[PDB]
Design a protein around this nucleic acid. Sequence first.
DNA 1: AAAAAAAAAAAACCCCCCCC
DNA 2: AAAAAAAAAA
DNA 3: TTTTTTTTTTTT
RNA 4: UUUUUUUUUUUU
Length: 1028
Amino acid sequence: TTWKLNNLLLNDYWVHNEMKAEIKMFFETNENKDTTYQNLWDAFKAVCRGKFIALNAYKRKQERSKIDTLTSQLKELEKQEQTHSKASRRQEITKIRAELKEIETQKTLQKINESRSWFFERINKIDRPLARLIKKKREKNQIDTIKNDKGDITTDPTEIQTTIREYYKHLYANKLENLEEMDTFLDTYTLPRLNQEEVESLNRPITGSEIVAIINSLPTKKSPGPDGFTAEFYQRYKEELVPFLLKLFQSIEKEGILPNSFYEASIILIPKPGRDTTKKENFRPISLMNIDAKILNKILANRIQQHIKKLIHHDQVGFIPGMQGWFNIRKSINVIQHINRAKDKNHMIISIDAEKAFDKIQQPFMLKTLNKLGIDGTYFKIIRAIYDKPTANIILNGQKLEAFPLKTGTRQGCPLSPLLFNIVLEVLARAIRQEKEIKGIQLGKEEVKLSLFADDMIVYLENPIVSAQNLLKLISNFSKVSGYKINVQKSQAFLYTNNRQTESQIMGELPFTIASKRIKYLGIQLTRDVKDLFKENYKPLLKEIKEETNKWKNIPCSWVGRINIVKMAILPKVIYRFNAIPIKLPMTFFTELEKTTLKFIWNQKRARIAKSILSQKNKAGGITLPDFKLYYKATVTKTAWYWYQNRDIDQWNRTEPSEIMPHIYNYLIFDKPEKNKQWGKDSLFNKWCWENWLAICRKLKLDPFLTPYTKINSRWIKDLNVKPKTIKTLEENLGITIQDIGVGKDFMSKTPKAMATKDKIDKWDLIKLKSFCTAKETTIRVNRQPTTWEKIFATYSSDKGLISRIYNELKQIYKKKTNNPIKKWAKDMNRHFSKEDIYAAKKHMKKCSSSLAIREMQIKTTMRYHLTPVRMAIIKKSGNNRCWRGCGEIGTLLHCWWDCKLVQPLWKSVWRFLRDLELEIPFDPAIPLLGIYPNEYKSCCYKDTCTRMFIAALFTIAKTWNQPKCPTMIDWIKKMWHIYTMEYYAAIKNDEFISFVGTWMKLETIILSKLSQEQKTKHRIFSLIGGN
DNA sequence: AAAAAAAAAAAACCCCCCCC
DNA sequence: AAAAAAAAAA
DNA sequence: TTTTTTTTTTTT
RNA sequence: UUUUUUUUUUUU
Ligand SMILES: [Zn+2]
């Protein structure tokens, strides 16, 4: 049984103080010149583990001190009673037993209420309790049955432990010593080398700010490594650990020796879903490293990541910042189209299936590759130290098995591991690209040979008979030195031939399996013919979504919870499918998706709140419903940003087949329109993007052909017969947009740099540029304030958050007219609300409470969610519109909520409570039903308590919507007390105790004043806060 | 000629919280 | 410019 | 009574 | 029960 630090122990004030004192004392006591900082760090970790154990034991003893004392007294009295019976001793025994039962019940209620508060704070939000609600129950890691090496089925713990340990030891023990072959392979193919500045940046001394940033960036609530220390320990005590972490990291920089804790890793085996649990090869292993080792590796990972752009070619998008996966996907699809359009088909797209690449990459080859790339000095020394003695131990069924060395393979669970693996695989990628005998596919002017995402490689080959054999030879040569072994039999490939005998010969000569219809790459079903891209990617997406909704048909959550479920599980899949294949989709797809989503959201019932209202912004109810058509439009138009930026690494944008206008996309956004050119006739992604961009620009009444962001090298200047040297000078000296040059009176007159640029340009180009820019039309079209759309697509040099910004802008643009239920409420109560009242009601809906159940109830009350007798009477085409519960009156929504004679007593009790709060709130239904207050009550010092009381009353009334009994004041007290308890424990957890007390003390006092002792006892109503 | 928006007509299912 | 959640891919 | 769907008209 | 990249949503 290993030791794991809990986050509850860290949050304790006394424990935190004692732990900080112990850390400071150890750092100022055991530091000397006879002990290295690595051994001192290991001793510090051990002492911290011991101190944490001692503090936890002390806390448990203190929490159980009363229980222990009462138990000892009870045992002594029982022994005395057995020795000699006495009535008074029996009375004492009974009293002690009653006190013990009361304390145990109080502790159980404490735990239950803490769990309930944690749940209710996230009841319907996009968070853990909802993700675990939709996800299938997690399979346990308790592996009791396995198939041994002799083919027998065994359940003996020793045999299964031995089998698993031996399998994972033999997996990581295949370390190669052929250094000469590694050197030969590295010298055979050219690799990039970092310059002096980048090497110095890598080898720069570590500073405190880097360690602080890495510690703050550590994800929370993550399983700790073998030492049991979580990231929360380092985040909470960073003010005391950062100096000693600096000392340790400088020591390891100078010496190249790491603490023994930096090597030990914990391997957890996950049973692969859909696979046999009795096979040793059907388990996914994951490695947990110590938090300090992860911090060091993350520092190194960031240091190498700041140069990974130069070290890694843009063909590899996995683990590379600023590179998205679909960069390859569309690219691959484009290649397929070019093959389908070729008159002579002699092509092959091979999906190379790497077999446990992370577990088979040779550490010596990785080190030699790092040395070859010019990475040397402190950084290389630290990396070599990391992989000098890596050791991992398997946690099987909660038991720590004997550790085995990681002789080969890259340490999983390491932040530096993905970048090192990319560096290693880049040698093979460049060898394939630099091999003249391995011919790629020529898409226009771009030769495409391979695309990469981590170890998932796709190779595009022309003339497969020779190209594929050369690729296999090169891959085998790379594997002989690096261990990057390929499961060829599992490498699905599309083979395009124009002759059956040629296809048969290629299949016979090559060991690659041939996929006739589809290949799964990055979760996308790439098709042999692009015309089936929909049929294999979006129709199966609809089928999967329908199956998921049918599985979630009886899920125990409300409509808000189901909307958040759609946003959490369904929305990312649809967004990813749109990003990978943004093709023109029929309205049938969107109609079916919307129908399925709406049926799931409303539990196969008719929508109580209009879809158009929820499709608006958060001001229209606070919940919002995902608009899939707007997300699709945003995804399609996103490519315009890459068009305008014109990155040299976005090769996918240059892979679109075309016969005319070879260079249009970089001259298409904020540029002169095409001169009646029928470009993109057979385009698959880009033409639809341009069409949607034009549609959005037309809807905005915007001119997208001459904007303030019109590039200097755009068609507007090139059509002036301006020499390319002048354009380059303008780009280098003034800026990138025509606004930087200036138009009208501002033409080359904004800066002395403009004077220099004018002096550096040929006079004819100056004359033509002045004629174009100083023209009235250009001046009025350029010198204008750009909108949010142009700013989104031009002013952002980074694509992070681009989809969200475009979607928000489209939702703002497509602000369809919707009915206002608050105005309907005003009509019901014979009142007129100003725009201030409407905004107040919307803000009350948005900010009703931290928990989502209270907000959902407030939204239901305000947005006319609840059904009324009038609605049912009209639906059933009958005159039985009399109000429910029996009053003989017409059952309007206002009457059922506020004006019912059987509901009036509850509101009168609420107003009596308000009077006891010294709040002269008028008996106005708008205040509780919509959150609309008169101008005389603009003070917010009492609005929180009033909101809690009103929402509790709304819950109580809704509970008895069609019951003949009146909404009971006791039920209202109980509901507001449940809210009080949940908010109390939430404020304790979230350190919001002061505001909670300020908003709940008077209400709690009024509650306790009007309740009898029996009611308080049987309803678990008792004081929870004091004078604090 | 095609797409988008607005208007009109038809249809539904007497509670509603609760439910990790 | 921070904190948290989830999902996608590997 | 409310929402969704279909049809018609208008604009590009 | 990891790590990296990217994405969305919510709270300022
Ligand atoms: Zn009534």
